[PDB]
Amino acid sequence: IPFDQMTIEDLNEVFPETKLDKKKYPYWPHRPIE
Amino acid sequence: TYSKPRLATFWHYAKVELVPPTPAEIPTAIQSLKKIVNSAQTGSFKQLTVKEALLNGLVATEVLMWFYVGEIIA
Amino acid sequence: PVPPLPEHGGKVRLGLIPEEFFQFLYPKTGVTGPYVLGTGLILYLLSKEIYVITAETFSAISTIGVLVYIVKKYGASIGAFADKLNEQKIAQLE
Amino acid sequence: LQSLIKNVWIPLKPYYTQVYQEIWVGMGLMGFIVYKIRSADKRSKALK
Amino acid sequence: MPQLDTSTWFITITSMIMTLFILFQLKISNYSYP
Amino acid sequence: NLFASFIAPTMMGLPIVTLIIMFPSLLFPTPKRLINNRTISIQQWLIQLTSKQMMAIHNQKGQTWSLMLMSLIMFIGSTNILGLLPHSFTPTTQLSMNLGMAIPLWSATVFTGFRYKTKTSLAHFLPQGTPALLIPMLVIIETISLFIQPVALAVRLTANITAGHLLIHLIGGATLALLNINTMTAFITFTILILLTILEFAVALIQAYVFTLLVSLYLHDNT
Amino acid sequence: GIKKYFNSYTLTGRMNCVLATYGGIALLVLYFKLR
Amino acid sequence: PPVQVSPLIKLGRYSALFLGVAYGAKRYNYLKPRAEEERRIAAEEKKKQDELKRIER
Amino acid sequence: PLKDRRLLEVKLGELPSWILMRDFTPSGIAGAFQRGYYRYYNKYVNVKKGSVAGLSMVLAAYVVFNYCRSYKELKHERLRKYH
Amino acid sequence: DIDTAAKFIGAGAATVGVAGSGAGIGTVFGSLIIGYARNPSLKQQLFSYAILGFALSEAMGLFCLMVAFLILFA
Amino acid sequence: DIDTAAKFIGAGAATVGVAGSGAGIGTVFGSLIIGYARNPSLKQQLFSYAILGFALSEAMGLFCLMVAFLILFAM
Amino acid sequence: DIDTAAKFIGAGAATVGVAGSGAGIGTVFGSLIIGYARNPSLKQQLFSYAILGFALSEAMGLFCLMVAFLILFAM
Amino acid sequence: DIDTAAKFIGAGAATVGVAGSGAGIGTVFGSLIIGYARNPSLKQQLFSYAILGFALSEAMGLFCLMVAFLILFAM
Amino acid sequence: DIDTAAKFIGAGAATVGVAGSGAGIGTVFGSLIIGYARNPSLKQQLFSYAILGFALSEAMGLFCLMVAFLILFAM
Amino acid sequence: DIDTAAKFIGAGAATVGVAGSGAGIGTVFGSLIIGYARNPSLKQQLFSYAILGFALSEAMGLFCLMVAFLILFA
Amino acid sequence: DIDTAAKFIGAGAATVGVAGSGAGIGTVFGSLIIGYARNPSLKQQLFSYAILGFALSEAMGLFCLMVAFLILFAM
Amino acid sequence: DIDTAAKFIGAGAATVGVAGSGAGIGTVFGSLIIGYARNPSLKQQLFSYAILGFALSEAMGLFCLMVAFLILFA
């Protein structure tokens, strides 16, 4: 599916490593500012 | 400045759209006005659709405010 | 699963007033109908003093001058900037 | 309000309870300050 | 000094809260990482 | 004669000035795809940049407030800009506005600083290892310059924003008068107006930055 | 002694000293309220 | 592609022109005198006010 | 062939028939404001090459909105008295 | 009225307090320019110190306008 | 009248609170040229920290003139 | 009465004796900046001296505010 | 006229905002001298910054002077 | 009485002399900090020069403050 | 006449600015001393810079004085 | 007599100048500290220069106070 | 009389435009101290310059006060 045709959940699905895990960083931007 | 090109472009339309009236079509205008009166008196305009009425009103107002323009001359 | 974008929104004359309005008005006067319409509207408003003139008017003039300056001199560059960011995210995620 | 609650209490629950405990107390202090000033001015202008 | 005609004060302040804590905290909270 | 624009207005006898404060929130739409149009891509980039550049100093726990600081900066900057338009209204220039938006954050910082790190916070009132001659003359000064945080932190921003509006109004009035009399002065004053408009565009942003930065490092001290 | 019991460099001494001065100024201000 | 003007609007045009021009001329002519007289009376009034403040400063 | 249409499509004298074919509850006001906003959004914003016009409208509208808000106080300075 | 004319006098006089604050702010930020040019590897800490100084010298400037307004409106 | 004269003189006094502004501007630009001449590489951050101070001094100037006008035109 | 009018004017002009604290503190903190840059392993002594300087400068600047209060409220 | 009295008194006392320009000119030109003396190379660009400060100083200058003449007689 | 008003305004004005003391003390400690930054082997001698310059500036302000008190409570 | 007093009051009050001339020129020639003391080979034109700055600030102060005067001779 | 008030107010407005001497003292002793912190073996000559400048500044500082005394008492 | 008191005011005001000269002299001598502490060899020229700077600032202050003298007898 072309990049223009997805929602953030889509990459949550296809690329779990890109997930923004909600446990180790409850807040925003959901992990530190390295 | 680029006044000349666009100004000539605008004369191209003005000389064919800004013209003063000529006695030739006066009968056509008056018969059209009478036809409008006929459509009004019996309530035939009720046959029209909204868009047409909006457009007619817009053009009527177009004619109108140019009346105040005429005053602006004065 | 999302629909895509169009390629360009409705064009706009002078940057403010959409064209379609020019089309709905075409049949009766064709070309120089809407423009004289607008000129009349504005000469009316200025002439019937529904719009007085004061200092804040000239404030409006200066702010609009600055804005037209910036848009005309940087719009294309900012657009290319934005598209660069988009394709950059594409690649870097690619 | 059900749409309202499911729109502004799913995302923002963890903030009001956890982080912003110490801004509500401040808002209370402001309640004191604003009440006091409005009362004082109303009374003074009532005098006049 | 129109800022001192205290009549309005209350209503103004109220807006802050919900605005500065209800609207934006949604919009921005919705933003996502690169 | 000219304070008019600061008069909290309503079109009729109803509270509309709770919408002049809503309008900014529209200009920032929120995204739902991965990539988007421009007017979201640019704003997203801008926020990413500033978040990276401001929360550097803070320690771990303190970084919990990122959302708050950036919401505050976005809102204040948006309002201070939108105000510039021909006949627009600026909520910030109402002193009540600023006090409302200033005091609670300040007090929340002081409270999270005294509830946690009690002894250290109390100590901060004595700069480390000062001479042992002036203790009374020093732990009075730090404690008076503490309570002058919130008052300055609001009254500043209020005065900044108001001054520009007043100055542009009056210069424009003098422009119209000169145009009545002569031309050279009219033109020169119009150019002055151009310059002031630019400068006001600038300060409208500088103030948002300064406000949120002061708050940021205050939280830094007592995180 | 006091200069090691009223330390101005560590934390504890600072807290003790500041608390002492708040207490003293409080006592004085209450003293002058009568007059 | 210019579109020829419908005759109706064509006729409606210049009648409005010249009747409005006449209307403006009439307005100017009829309005000048009363306004001048009112302003002159106001001048008398302000002279009276100036004398008042001169003797009642 | 339809009871509901677009108001521009409508036939004039049926105007009261339409006014009585629709819903005027406040939810039917929210469902109208949202529709208008989304028309504007999806037509001038959510497009790859959005431009100034894709935004300048709302600003040029809010300016007139505030001008209307400001009319009453502006009636004390019209330059010419016998307008 | 003289009883308020003198009040105007006092407000106008007390206005000038901040001038010291203007001078102090300017000199501090000049010092930050120089001490960032010299050893650019300490932007962070140097900026922190400069803004701290700014806070202090703006508080000690706004005291005076606060007092001037207090005089004017009471 | 006496109130009007008092307004005028109070305004004249309020005017002179600007000097801090001019002093700060001059000094910050001197510091810029200096801290430049001996490190031409990082002109960008030098100039940025120049403009920030410029703003944080013009702010004081406007404080002063704002109070002046506030007195003159609207008590 | 003119008496109270002079009270007000005198307080308003005497509170002018705080700009001095402004400029003094500005110079002190600028010097702290520079002198910390060159010798970054003595901050503790630089800070102690800087605090001495700020404290005692602002005190001698605050005596004028105290005189304004003590001339207005009482004498 | 008493109002003319305060007219001219405010007119004079508002012309004292010019110190903010003189001090800045002095500082900026001194900074030029020192910086140029260090490095004799970037002379053009340094003088450019110098003119920019020159202008931003006479800015406050003509600012205050224009306000004085604004309420010197007319307003 | 008018005498009270004149004394009152005069004392309020005269007590502005403390500005110079603020600026002095500021620059004195600024220079001590910068100078000590270079060569810390002078602590005591440096500090002595510091105290001396301190005493002189503070005294040159104390003269004005004390004479203001003199005119207020004596004449 | 009250305004007669105001003439001289304002004219006298309208020269305190020259303080700026002092601060400037002091800083100017101080910077020149240091400069020539760091690089003796630039004297013959650092002097030109100094005379430029001196002329500038002196002119500003002296025209402020001329203001004071024209008030004095209304 | 009103000249009593004029005398008092003139003295108040005249004593103000002494701030310049405070600035000068502060500057000269700051420079002394820096100098001696550079070349600690010219100590004596450095101190001599500092004393020269000190005296030359308080000279006209006291000159200001002297004109103040003249105006207040004699005329 | 008004003129006497007004003259007194004018003098007590115009006499304040010399504090800046004090700060200026202080700065010029601070500069000379620094410069000599750098380059001991050319003492003779450091002083040859500082003296002229002092002369100029002193002259400026003397005129600033001659204003007041003339006021006293204007």
Author numbering:
A (entry chain d): 125 to 158
B (entry chain g): 20 to 93
C (entry chain b): 1 to 94
D (entry chain j): 2 to 49
E (entry chain 8): 1 to 34
F (entry chain a): 4 to 226
G (entry chain k): 13 to 47
H (entry chain e): 2 to 58
What does the paper say about this structure?
The bovine structure shows that the structures of the membrane domains of porcine ATP synthases in a tetrameric complex have been seriously misinterpreted. The structure of the dimeric bovine ATP synthase is consistent with chemical cross-linking data, and the attribution of subunits is the same as in the dimeric yeast membrane domain. The bovine structure differs significantly from those of dimeric complexes in a tetrameric form of the closely related porcine enzyme where subunit j was misidentified as subunit k, and subunit k as a hypothetical protein. Also, porcine subunit j was built as a polyalanine α-helix in the central cavity of the c8-ring, whereas the cavity is most likely to be occupied by lipids (see below), and other differences occur in the structures of subunits b, c, e, f, g, and A6L. The central cavity of the c8-ring contains a poorly defined, noisy density observed also in the porcine and yeast c-rings (S13 A–E).
